[PDB]
Amino acid sequence: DVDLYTDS
Amino acid sequence: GEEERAFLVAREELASALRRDSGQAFSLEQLRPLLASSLPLAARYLQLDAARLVRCNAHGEPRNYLNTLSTALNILEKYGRNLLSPQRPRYWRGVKFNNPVFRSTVDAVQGGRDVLRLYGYTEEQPDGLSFPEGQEEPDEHQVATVTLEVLLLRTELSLLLQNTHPRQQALEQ
Numbered sequence: 001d002v003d004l005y006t007d008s
Numbered sequence: 009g010e011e012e013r014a015f016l017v018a019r020e021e022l023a024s025a026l027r028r029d030s031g032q033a034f035s036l037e038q039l040r041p042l043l044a045s046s047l048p049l050a051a052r053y054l055q056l057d058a059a060r061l062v063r064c065n066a067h068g069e070p071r072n073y074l075n076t077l078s079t080a081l082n083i084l085e086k087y088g089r090n091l092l093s094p095q096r097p098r099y100w101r102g103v104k105f106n107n108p109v110f111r112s113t114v115d116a117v118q119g120g121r122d123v124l125r126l127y128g129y130t131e132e133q134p135d136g137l138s139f140p141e142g143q144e145e146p147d148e149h150q151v152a153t154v155t156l157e158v159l160l161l162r163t164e165l166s167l168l169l170q171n172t173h174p175r176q177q178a179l180e181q
Contacts, residue, residue, distance in 0.1 A: 005098075005104065007104035
């Protein structure tokens with residue numbers, strides 16, 4: 001899945 | 009009067025379904041009652057500020073900004089369905105402004121971050137939005153209501169991009 005949260 | 013009643017019954021019917029199965033796809037038949045309602049646009053969206061989201065992002069050509077808006081809405085819909093999924097993703101409690109996808113899709117539109125606050129990302133920091141540490145879990149009823157209107161509005165913009173909206177000359181306003 002695609003990361004929509006972390007700043008990194 | 010009776011038009012508002014038919015509208016709010018279909019509204020809760022899809023929102024409840026989306027609360028049972030967060031990954032539940034909806035067809036245009038199921039959504040036609042909300043799209044085709046005679047009610048004005050301002051009255052068919054109760055959480056999402058649809059009037060502003062459309063007008064305040066009409067820059068350049070429609071083929072450009074209507075795709076830019078549809079994309080932000082598609083991602084926002086995922087933000088909503090994620091909070092409803094039986095296994096919420098890790099880090100679901102906060103969204104940081106420098107996240108690549110959010111920056112280049114959601115943050116790129118005026119009102120995108122306002123939709124996150126509707127989901128429950130109310131606490132603002134200089135690096136992003138996040139849920140209140142006190143709140144244990146999402147308000148399943150509020151998330152589902154917001155996701156449906158995001159899903160719905162994106163659908164209206166899709167019909168216009170296909171040029172087959174029930175009242176296309178209307179939203180031309």
